[PDB]
């Protein structure tokens, strides 16, 4: 930290969201100042989970599964060949959790 560490990087690389009990939708996130420019972020469809009869069960909850990912941010702005490594939080999908009803 408190010292810039610059490295070289070669950029030339060599539908359950519908059937889930905690379903979700992917929303397009586009940023021209970022690599990857397009990131698909998941948003839970409901607060509850789908039960065996196809209805929303409010005794269980859909919660987003969030992961930290690396992205490249243009530095300076609009630079095609210089970036800063940035860590952002993204929603990958949703899982169904039971609320804590204990002690």
């Amino acid at each position, epitope marked *: 930290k408190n010292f810039p560490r610059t490295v070289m990087v070669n950029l030339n690389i060599h539908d359950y969201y519908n059937r889930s009990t905690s379903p979700w*939708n992917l929303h397009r996130n586009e940023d021209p100042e970022r690599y990857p420019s397009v990131i698909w*972020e*998941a*948003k*839970c*469809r*409901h*607060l*509850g989970c789908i039960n065996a009869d196809g209805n929303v069960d*409010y*005794h*269980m*909850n859909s*919660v*987003p599964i*969030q992961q930290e990912i690396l992205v490249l941010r243009r530095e300076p702005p609009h630079s095609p060949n210089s970036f800063r490594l940035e860590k952002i*939080l993204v*929603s990958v999908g949703c899982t169904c*959790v039971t*609320p*804590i*009803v*204990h*002690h």
Partner: antibody
Amino acid sequence: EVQLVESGGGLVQPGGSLRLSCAASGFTFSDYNMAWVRQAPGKGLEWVATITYEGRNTYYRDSVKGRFTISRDNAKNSLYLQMNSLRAEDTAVYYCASPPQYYEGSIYRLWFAHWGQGTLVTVSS
Amino acid sequence: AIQLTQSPSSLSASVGDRVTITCRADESVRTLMHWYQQKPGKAPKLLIYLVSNSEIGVPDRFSGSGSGTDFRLTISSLQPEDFATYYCQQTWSDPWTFGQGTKVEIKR
């Protein structure tokens, strides 16, 4: 980061009118329902009004119905609260609150995951 | 319409103590119960959503539990910065209501 910034709070004579504004940033404002929550000096939180993502539906606390109007300008990313016929019960800090970005904005029963700084409205002669 | 009652209205605890605040609803809210922390002269901050889920950035010492009419917010080990008023909120039915708040003070 999500940011909500309020303006418009001030001294207003009883029976008068005041307009609160909330500038939003850091999220797709037009995708979410927005609300105003107030707190009387030394008292608890009290929901005031809710407006849907594209302003087609509005909901109000019984005590403010007919006196307050919640509106939004999705193009300017801002929320408004037009307050008329102001009474002593309306002296409070007013907050604009937004729902969580990782849930679909079509879910009405979402909580307030982001709040503005608050703007003080003082109803006094 | 749905009334929420918090207990106690205020409490004082030493650093390291386990603090418990209850919230009781007069009708069931199922899992649509949330907790907020409000520090003096600051806006409320969301702590817990949907009974037990902490938002990212909320310390592990805060946990929520409950179901239907009885809910609880626990601070496993109280820290000096936990001085604040905590509010529960139900979003199950209109109008959305809040508890009266619980003021948490530090014994030192």
